[PDB]
Design a protein around this ligand. Structure first.
Ligand SMILES: *[C@@H]1O[C@H](CO)[C@@H](O[C@@H]2O[C@H](CO)[C@@H](O)[C@H](O)[C@H]2NC(C)=O)[C@H](O)[C@H]1NC(C)=O
Ligand SMILES: O=C(O)[C@H]1CN(CCCP(=O)(O)O)CCN1
Lengths: 48, 50, 48
């Protein structure tokens, strides 16, 4: 299988639910914490 | 502990909203609110095409 | 929105509608958009 040309719609996937929940701030906290320890690269080397 | 520059202006309310090519950092996250980014970046490596 | 599940974890895009309905956190994983085809077996076509 081959990819195309140039990629478009350079978006992001994150996490969000109803507004009754300040958990999403802790979610941002966790994503930056893993930015400070290299954990998404662990997920990448495991899966992607 | 005291912020300067654009972050200092925002902290001291001198600058209400911020505009500039500044990335997202945890230290700034504790003192300001990071909005939704409009473009991506990160730890990239560039090499000669050769 | 009906209250069945509490939090969502899934790679969902963030368009305008569901963002108006519910807010989202930082995008844990960046992404783009590409067409996919099963390439083609290299074959030179000619008679003789
Ligand atoms: C969401 O993030 C907030 C931001 O800190 C967390 O709030 C802290 O809660 C801990 C105990 O859970 C306290 O010791 C801190 O004083 C709180 N900090 C502040 C200023 O809010 C919270 O833990 C996270 N999750 C929850 C449970 O909401
Ligand atoms: O947020 C900021 O302050 C700027 C800073 N720039 C730093 C350039 C990389 P280095 O620090 O020189 O290694 C990147 C864009 N955002």
């Amino acid at each position: 299988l081959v990819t195309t040309g140039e990629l478009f719609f350079r978006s992001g996937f994150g996490i969000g639910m109803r507004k009754d929940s300040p958990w999403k701030q802790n979610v941002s906290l966790s994503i930056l914490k893993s930015h400070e320890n290299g954990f998404m690269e662990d997920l990448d080397k495991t899966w992607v | 502990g005291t912020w300067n520059g654009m972050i200092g202006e925002v902290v001291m309310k001198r600058a209400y909203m911020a505009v500039g090519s500044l990335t997202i950092n945890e230290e700034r996250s504790e003192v300001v609110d990071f909005s939704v980014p409009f473009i991506e970046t990160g730890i990239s490596v560039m090499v000669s095409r050769s | 929105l009906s209250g069945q599940a509490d939090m969502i974890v899934a790679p969902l895009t963030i368009n305008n509608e569901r963002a108006q309905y519910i807010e989202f956190s930082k995008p844990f994983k960046y992404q783009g958009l590409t067409i996919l085809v099963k390439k083609e077996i290299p074959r030179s076509t000619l008679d003789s």
